[PDB]
RNA sequence: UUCACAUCGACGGGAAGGUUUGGCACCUCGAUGUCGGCUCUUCGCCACCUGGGGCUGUAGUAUGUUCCAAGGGUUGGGCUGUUCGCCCAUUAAAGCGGUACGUGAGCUGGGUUCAGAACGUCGUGAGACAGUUCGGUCCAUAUCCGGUGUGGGCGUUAGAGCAUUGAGAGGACCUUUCCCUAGUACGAGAGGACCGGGAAGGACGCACCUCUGGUGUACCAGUUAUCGUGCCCACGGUAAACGCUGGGUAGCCAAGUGCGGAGCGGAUAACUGCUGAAAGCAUCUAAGUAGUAAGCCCACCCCAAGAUGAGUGCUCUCCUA
RNA sequence: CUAUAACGGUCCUAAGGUAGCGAAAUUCCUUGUCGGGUAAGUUCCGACCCGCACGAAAGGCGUAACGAUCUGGGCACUGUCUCGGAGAGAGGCUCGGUGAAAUAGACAUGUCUGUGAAGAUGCGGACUACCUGCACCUGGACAGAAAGACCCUAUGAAGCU
RNA sequence: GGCCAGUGAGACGAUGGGGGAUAAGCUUCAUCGUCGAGAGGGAAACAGCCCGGAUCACCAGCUAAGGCCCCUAAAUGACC
RNA sequence: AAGGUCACGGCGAGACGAGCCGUUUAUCAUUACGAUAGGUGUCAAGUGGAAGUGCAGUGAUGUAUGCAGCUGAGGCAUCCUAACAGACCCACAGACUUGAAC
């Protein structure tokens, strides 16, 4: 049974599923709008929301928190720079699941991610 | 574990019909989402 | 389950377990089972088609 | 929870060391036994200058456990080893002196432990 | 109580009734008070 | 039937009731999201028993369709979701015009009963449905935790029903009994109750006197 | 001590049961897998305990034997492959059996002692022992019935949303010490009640996470080896499905916490009776009728009108051509 | 004194078992009796010798070291267990693709009880069951295998003496 | 006699016995009946028990064994 | 048509079906309903003093900022994101017959 354990987890394991949300919300970061799972796609928005608003409050320690988090070095230091003057006065909710038609081979029920 | 015997005609289009009928199923729900890609705002299919 | 306890409890289960029996179970039987309409009070409910009184043919009851 | 093959420490000067415990009397559960459950003892090893030696099958008092003592107070009370009384059925001990505290919940039916014992919590 | 399933009336005043279908045995002496065959 | 008409609320949480005497009760916190409003009396006249029929649940109107909307303005009360009776002996004094009840009936009655969904556990197997043993660990064995034998040999050619095999164990509502009722709250519509109601916080709870 | 029948009952006799060893060889060898253990039933009474009673060579405690009663229980262990059995600590008691070992298409050891080897004995020998010892593969995705859960269709005579009655069925109805009565009846003392209450337990069951914890791969903290982040700091990856540890919220769980097992409710079995005749005496009965069992039913908790006998009550909607 | 036989005679053999061992890998009775270990020990060790049926190169009695050898006991250690519980993966469940197999007379394939080639969904009487899926469990279909390795028969086969 | 087959495992029931335990649906014989190789009716079902011997048709009648409350045909027939 | 089903956002419900709770000018005001899930802001709560700087020390390290820093499966608030767009099933007095009064 699985009450009250709001911990999503995917098809992979514990560590292989950490690498997966880290490495797919940098390159949500990266390209703004992913073709993922639906599962994928909430996955990425808790994680996404805490790295948008991780880099709001623009320190150093949330900065190699962030940059701790994020694979790619040079997208961190394209964050901070960009998420006050864009994403200021939002509070919350900075994405978008705009779902599509199922992939060919699976039907898995497929997604895709904004920024908004 | 090994089948004592076979099944009839009776029995067998009986199965296999419950399991295109959950075919049939899962069709009106793709009409329905073939009817509403159509001309509307909906906020989904990029 | 003795006689008294069902004739305390629910007595029109009584006649009702007794023609039972007497009609054949099969698929008409069945059928003919529902003819039977057994009531515990005085009065019963139908006035149907002037229900007449049954013919006994017994002369021992 | 006393199991019926554990090792209890002595809390008197009765005679004996430690002792195998056995299959307790009052409480039919038998495989949790919690404070003031008499327990059939027997010694594993003991002090020899006294008349009490090994393989001796005796009855004992549990006064001390590893596992907690829920009391209407509030508290919880518990200890880091286990121990025992050597006992008669009468009461008292044949050992006076008592080593180590005990509780106070025992006062009500073995009142020679607690009249004998160094504290009382 | 002797279910002796058929000894006689033994005592002198074993007197023999039969009561709810079974045959028992009365006497003064407790002793002889039996419930026959 | 029952002893009396009672009430029902939802669980809010567990907390610990500390006594003057100095002792520490565990108590289950219950509130009241509405007046238990009798919406409904069928009485020995216009039924074949006599019940009094109250709800819970005051709502919005689309969130409750026509038949129960229309049933309950047939009475002149707010619309509302939950709906039970309790079958009560042919003595009884209850409009079904809006009696909001106020709970003091039951601080004097030191015992109530209470009934309510406890949480479900979905398919369960035998060793914690029926309180079964396990199989050997180890030792070469291989029926861990199974379910083992099911019937008898040749004889009986089948299984016995009602045969404990696993299946889906909680969801039904119970009723726990004799559960003695502790410090009310007349402002913060709350009452303290000592004990362990059926489910997690939020569910509804029938809370009614004893049968005894 | 007298005394066949409180209790045993010699010499004999009459039955029931199919649980031992047997007799027959009637189904099965193009295969019905024996013995023990684990798990999990269910049933019988020829009753070990619990409930009621009679008799006692029953003063009371405890009995001996026996009647009704199978609802419930019938421990943990040392030996042995063990069934059985012996012993220890107890317990109210540690019942005997059926269900093909009850149960190996649920699971494991001694064995129809399989193939290797050794000891004794037999045989000239190959080899053999209803003698002993060591080692020795055990298969499997449920077609149908059966079961436990959970739907979908259709029916319930318009279509629905709720609300419940309850036919029927399940579970629970178990049990022990300690105290008052009272050291009172009884007994020369020693001992020590029935009956009616209370309290603490045990198993079982239904729940829950407030406390105490176990886990908790949401988590945070310490540290080893190493590779990356250009480098120091500080982090990230890996050391299976936590690198190893230290704790933990919410879940789940118990060892923890609450609750349950109620009934001057109905009828009975054994028994005690009240009037009371067939034989003007009598007798529990032939008429009527009273006390009373953990047993039966109801009440108790849940499911429950597919209960096709398909229930009852309230409410909504059937419009245009 | 009860014993037991140092010792004796007799029958038959080729000779009647020497040292040492001895309820043993050997002991049926037997869980022999005693002592140790254990709360309790048909297993173990130390003894007695009543050795069914030890015994001196088919060697006997011993012992250091050695053994994935057998067996008895103890310390530490732990889910083996009391008495289970939680968590992580691969399956299992659902969806999309691909897609078998053993088996199979036809199956419109209930329970009790009785009968019957003596253990019946198929026969009889009664009771109970709306139809049909899905997920688990395996009591029955004397379930699947595979012309019973055990037992016996063959005027069978073969190895060996 | 000629040509030419099978069969040579029997079973139960009555009587006459032996083996047994005058136990077995047990075993072996002797006479007979049935089944084997025999359908139908009665026996609830059910090889051997009773009636009875099926060429075939009839939407014909009378009977044997056995039955005449209902399931299920015929008497809730009569008198002791 | 009433009422359902799909879809949609999920669940203290759950193998799948089920079930349950939402499905937005998602109140306005004088006092119980129109916050479903995520994010955010705070409060319980867990580990427990983070980085950076200064100071002391030859250095390991300790100390102040600082119950700070992360975690936020739980509570409340907040419409910032997604609850958009839909679709489909069920309709049109409910056969036949007696009795009662209107």
Redesign the pocket.
Known sequence: ???????????????????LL?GLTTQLLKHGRIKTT?AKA?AM??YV??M???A??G????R??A???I?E?QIVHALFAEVPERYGD??????????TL?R??????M?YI?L? | ???????????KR??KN?WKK??Y??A??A???A????T?????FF | ??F??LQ???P??II??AV???????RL???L??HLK?YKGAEHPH????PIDLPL????? | ?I???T?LNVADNSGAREL?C??I????????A?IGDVI?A???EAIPNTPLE????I?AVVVRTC??L?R?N?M?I?YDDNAAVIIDQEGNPKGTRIFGAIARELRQKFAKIVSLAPEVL | ????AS??P?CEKC?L??????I?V?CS???????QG | ??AGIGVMGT?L????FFEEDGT?????VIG????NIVT?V?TES????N?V?VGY???????????????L???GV??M?????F?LVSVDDFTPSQK?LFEELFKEGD?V?I?????????????????????????????H????????????????????????????????????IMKIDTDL?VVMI??????????LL?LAPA??
């Open positions: 049974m699985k009450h009250g354990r709001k911990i999503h987890r995917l098809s992979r394991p514990a560590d292989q599923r950490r690498a880290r639906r909430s928005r808790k929301d805490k948008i608003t991780l709001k409050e320190s150093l320690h949330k190699r928190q940059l701790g988090f694979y070095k939002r509070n919350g909710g900075y994405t978008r699941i705009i779902r199922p060919r081979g699976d039907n898995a029920p997604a904004e908004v | 574990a090994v089948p004592k015997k076979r099944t009839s005609i009776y029995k009986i199965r419950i959950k075919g199923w899962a009106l729900k009409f329905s989402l009817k509403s890609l159509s509307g705002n909906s906020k989904s | 389950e003795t008294d306890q305390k409890r629910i029109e289960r009702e377990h039972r029996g007497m009609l054949p179970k099969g039987g069945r059928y089972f529902n057994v006035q149907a088609q002037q043919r017994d002369k021992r009851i | 929870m199991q019926p093959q090792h195998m056995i299959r009397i009052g409480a039919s559960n038998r495989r949790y919690r059939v027997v010694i594993k090994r393989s001796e099958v009855r596992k907690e829920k209407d509030g919880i518990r | 109580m002797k279910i002796r000894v006689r033994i007197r009734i039969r009561r709810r279908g079974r028992i009365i002496n407790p002793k002889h008070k039996q419930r | 039937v029952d669980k949480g567990m907390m610990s520490v009760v565990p108590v289950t009241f999201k509405e007046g409904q069928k216009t039924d074949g028993y019940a029929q649940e005051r709502l919005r109107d689309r969130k409750l369709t026509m038949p129960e909307r229309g049933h303005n047939k009475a707010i619309p979701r939950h709906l039970q009776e079958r909001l015992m009963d009934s309510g969904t406890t949480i479900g556990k979905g398919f369960q197997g035998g060793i914690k449905r029926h309180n079964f043993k396990r199989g050997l660990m180890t030792h070469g064995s291989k029926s935790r199974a379910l083992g034998s099911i019937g008898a040999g040749t004889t009986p050619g089948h299984v016995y029903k009602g045969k404990k095999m696993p299946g889906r164990m909680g969801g039904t509502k119970t009723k726990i009994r004799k559960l003695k519509r000592k004990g362990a109601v059926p489910g997690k916080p939020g569910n029938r049968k005894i």
